[PDB]
Amino acid sequence: HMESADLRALAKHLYDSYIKSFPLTKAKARAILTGKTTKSPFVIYDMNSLMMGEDKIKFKHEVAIRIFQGCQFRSVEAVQEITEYAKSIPGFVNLDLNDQVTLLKYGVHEIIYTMLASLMNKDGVLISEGQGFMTREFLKSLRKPFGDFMEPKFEFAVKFNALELDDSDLAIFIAVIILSGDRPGLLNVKPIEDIQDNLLQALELQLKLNHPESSQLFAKLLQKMTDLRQIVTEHVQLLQVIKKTETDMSLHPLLQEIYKDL
Amino acid sequence: MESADLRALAKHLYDSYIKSFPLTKAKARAILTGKKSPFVIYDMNSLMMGEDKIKFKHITSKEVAIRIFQGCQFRSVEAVQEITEYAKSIPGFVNLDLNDQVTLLKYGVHEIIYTMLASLMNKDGVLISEGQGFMTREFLKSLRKPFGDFMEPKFEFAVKFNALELDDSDLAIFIAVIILSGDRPGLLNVKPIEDIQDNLLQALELQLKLNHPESSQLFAKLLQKMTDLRQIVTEHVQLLQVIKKTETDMSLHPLLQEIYK
Numbered sequence: 001h002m003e004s005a006d007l008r009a010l011a012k013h014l015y016d017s018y019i020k021s022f023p024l025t026k027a028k029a030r031a032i033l034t035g036k037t038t039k040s041p042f043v044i045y046d047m048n049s050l051m052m053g054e055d056k057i058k059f060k061h062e063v064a065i066r067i068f069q070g071c072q073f074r075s076v077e078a079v080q081e082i083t084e085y086a087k088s089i090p091g092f093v094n095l096d097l098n099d100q101v102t103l104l105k106y107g108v109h110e111i112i113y114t115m116l117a118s119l120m121n122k123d124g125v126l127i128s129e130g131q132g133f134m135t136r137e138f139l140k141s142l143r144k145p146f147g148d149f150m151e152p153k154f155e156f157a158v159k160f161n162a163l164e165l166d167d168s169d170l171a172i173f174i175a176v177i178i179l180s181g182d183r184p185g186l187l188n189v190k191p192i193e194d195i196q197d198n199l200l201q202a203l204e205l206q207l208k209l210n211h212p213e214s215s216q217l218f219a220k221l222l223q224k225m226t227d228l229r230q231i232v233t234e235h236v237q238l239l240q241v242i243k244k245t246e247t248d249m250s251l252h253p254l255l256q257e258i259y260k261d262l
Numbered sequence: 263m264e265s266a267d268l269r270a271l272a273k274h275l276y277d278s279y280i281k282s283f284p285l286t287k288a289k290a291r292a293i294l295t296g297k298k299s300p301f302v303i304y305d306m307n308s309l310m311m312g313e314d315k316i317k318f319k320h321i322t323s324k325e326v327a328i329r330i331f332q333g334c335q336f337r338s339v340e341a342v343q344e345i346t347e348y349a350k351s352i353p354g355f356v357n358l359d360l361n362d363q364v365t366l367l368k369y370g371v372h373e374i375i376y377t378m379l380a381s382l383m384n385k386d387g388v389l390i391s392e393g394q395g396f397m398t399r400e401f402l403k404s405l406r407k408p409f410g411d412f413m414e415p416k417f418e419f420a421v422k423f424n425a426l427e428l429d430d431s432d433l434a435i436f437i438a439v440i441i442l443s444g445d446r447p448g449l450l451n452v453k454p455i456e457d458i459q460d461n462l463l464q465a466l467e468l469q470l471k472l473n474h475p476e477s478s479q480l481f482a483k484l485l486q487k488m489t490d491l492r493q494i495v496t497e498h499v500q501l502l503q504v505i506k507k508t509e510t511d512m513s514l515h516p517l518l519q520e521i522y523k
């Protein structure tokens with residue numbers, strides 16, 4: 001339902017808007033993680049280095065709570081960037097306004113975990129626009145339920161990163177996630193699915209041109225949407241334990257609204 | 263992988279799918295749409311008459327809601343054996359590590375049962391006993407305590423899944439894809455499983471293009487349903503646990519408890 005040139009044009013549009021919307025790309029994150037440059041992050045691996053990192057790293061946003069609350073504020077910034085990106089997806093702002101809210105409500109976390117994988121390897125995650133690197137072992141060692149928060153994200157990212165996607169692939173994949181016609185409470189499924197159909201055609205052609213030797217990469221990427229859904233559900237149940245255990249811990253109102261009745 | 267090889271693989275699976283499963287989607291749709299009218303169970307009195315006249319096996323505690331629930335469990339155990347026989351016809355499956363064969367079936371059967379159950383359902387009810395009976399959605403949803411809300415999610419899934427309008431030749435490949443899932447926990451040799459799934463996916467993609475040329479990106483939409491299947495199977499497990507801990511009248515002969523574990 002779309003010619004090849006139109007699908008290439010749509011792929012280029014989305015990549016361009018992705019570069020404009022997300023300040024830390026996978027390409028930059030990989031150049032920081034693979035090193036070979038003098039761009040080097042400060043590495044936080046224990047309590048003493050955290051204390052030194054806060055002195056050296058210029059953070060834009062008890063140790064476990066401090067790290068948790070900071071993650072929440074980074075997630076809110078991520079929602080803002082994802083929302084800016086979503087408005088560039090052709091057709092999205094023309095949808096019913098309640099459906100725009102619904103698509104963002106259920107899509108933003110799946111996108112956050114997708115894009116978080118770009119900042120991750122098996123040993124830890126880049127933080128503060130790549131200025132810092134916090135080890136997976138240090139996060140797993142946090143007290144109470146906080147230790148178990150990041151480990152599922154690392155588990156996903158190790159598998160997702162084996163697909164070797166780049167930002168130009170990811171730009172379309174993220175659009176596909178937002179324009180999901182199966183979100184609960186949608187009023188007008190038909191125009192959402194028509195946009196997703198074009199996005200899926202564009203993703204399929206993008207993966208064939210950019211990864212010609214990666215057989216059925218399109219199918220394998222769509223199957224990862226299953227892993228994303230699973231970790232979002234785990235995440236929601238994990239916060240509920242914190243809400244009942246940590247009663248003095250505030251959650252950001254934007255995050256409060258997203259998780260409500262999910 | 264050439265097109266003729268993919269078509270050969272698609273036809274092999276369709277042929278085996280027909281032999282392994284007692285009621286095809288095509289035959290089920292002919293019964294459901296009214297095109298030997300099945301005996302209809304729509305309340306307690308018709309249930310009792312169905313057990314007396316048709317004598318439905320698996321629906322033979324004296325409480326009705328429990329009896330119907332256990333009957334779903336008993337049919338699902340029968341379905342597992344049909345799925346196991348079908349799996350053996352998938353090229354490459356029996357050549358896998360024997361523990362990996364068991365693991366793929368153990369973790370795949372719930373998703374496959376839900377998928378194939380949809381072939382037997384419409385928005386008003388479900389066929390039972392090889393299409394000889396039809397039990398209404400309202401009767402199942404009206405069962406007491408948690409049993410009623412146990413049945414309704416199955417219908418909600420099936421109504422959405424059936425909107426894709428797959429036929430048996432599509433489903434035969436799709437079921438094979440689910441079985442050859444390389445991400446099941448405890449697999450020892452993932453590589454040959456993903457190599458077989460890659461062939462099956464190529465065969466499903468081509469099958470869907472030739473069989474539904476007007477249904478844009480149906481391949482993508484069907485793979486997106488694997489998300490729904492995983493989600494409802496996880497929900498299913500939690501619902502069973504609540505029933506296991508709450509209900510005291512669910513006891514069977516210990517030998518039957520072992521069979522239908």
Ligand SMILES: O=C(O)c1ccc(-c2nn(C(=O)c3c(Cl)cccc3C(F)(F)F)c3ccccc23)c(OCc2ccccc2)c1
Nearest residue numbers: 059060061066067070071074075078112116126127128134
């Ligand atoms: O201030 C800052 O610039 C800043 C910046 C980042 C973090 C921080 N983010 N984060 C994430 O997962 C993450 C990331 Cl990388 C990128 C995008 C979206 C997300 C999230 F949406 F998924 F959230 C973490 C996971 C584990 C630990 C930290 C992060 C951050 O953490 C708070 C913190 C860090 C160190 C010391 C004290 C507090 C702070």
Ligand SMILES: O=C(O)c1ccc(-c2nn(C(=O)c3c(Cl)cccc3C(F)(F)F)c3ccccc23)c(OCc2ccccc2)c1
Nearest residue numbers: 321330333334335337338341372375376378379390413416
């Ligand atoms: O023919 C067939 O392929 C087939 C296949 C499935 C059912 C049937 N299973 N089922 C379940 O809950 C279920 C499911 Cl989805 C997946 C795994 C395990 C279970 C269960 F173990 F938990 F059971 C149902 C819930 C409601 C309605 C039907 C099912 C099935 O039901 C026939 C039936 C219906 C009512 C009374 C007696 C039999 C038939």
